[PDB]
Structure 1
C-alpha cells in the first residue's frame, strides 16, 4: 500500500511551470499526510523530497439533462525534490 498515495501527475501549464525548478505536483489520495506523500514519492521515484505542499481541489459541479451533478474531490500535493534531482518519468 504505497503506490496508492500517488494518483497521477497533474498536467497543466502551471504544473509544468515548476518542473523547471524542483517542483513536481500531482494528485495524491485525499487522506494523505505530507509526511506520507513524502515517504511515498520518495520510495516511488527514488528521489529525496525536501518539501511537500498540499491543497484540496473542491470538485466542481457539472451536470447533464435534468440530472444535477457533483465531481469528486481531490488533493494536489506538490513536491520539492532535493537540489539537482529530477524525475524523467514526469519530464515528458
Structure 2
C-alpha cells in the first residue's frame, strides 16, 4: 500500500509553476480519496500535507490505422505542503 496510491508525477509547464508554492501534483490511482492521498504522501515524502484538490482526466481517445481506441483514464491530485516544507524529490 501507500506506494500504490501515488503513481507518477504530472510533468507539465502548468504542474511546474506549481512548485513555487508547496503545490506538487500527481497522477494518482483513480479510486483513492482525498484522505487516502494525504496520508499516502505524508508517508512517501515525510512532508506535511495541508490541502488536497483532486480531479479526473477523461483519457484521450486515439487511433492507429483502422484500429480505434482509448487511453486509460486518469486522476490527478494536486497536494499542498506545509509552509517551509518542500519535496526535494520533485525539484527537477
For Structure 1 versus Structure 2, the TM-score category normalised by the shorter chain is over 0.9
Unaligned ranges ≥5, structure 1? none
Q: Distance in 2 between matches of 1:39 and 1:22?
A: 16
Q: Deviations over 1:55-85 (max 9, x none)?
A: 0000010111100011000001000001110
Which residue does 1:3 correspond to in 2? Answer: 3
Consecutive unaligned residues in structure 2, runs of 5 or more: none
The alignment's TM-score, normalised by the length of structure 1, stands at 0.98
Tell me the matched-pair count. Answer: 92
Residue 22 of structure 1 deviates from its aligned partner by 1.2
Match of 2:31 in 1: 31
- 1:45 offset after TM fit, Å? 0.5
Q: Deviations over 1:27-46 (max 9, x none)?
A: 00000000010000100010
More helix by share: 2
Aligned Cα RMSD in Å?
0.5
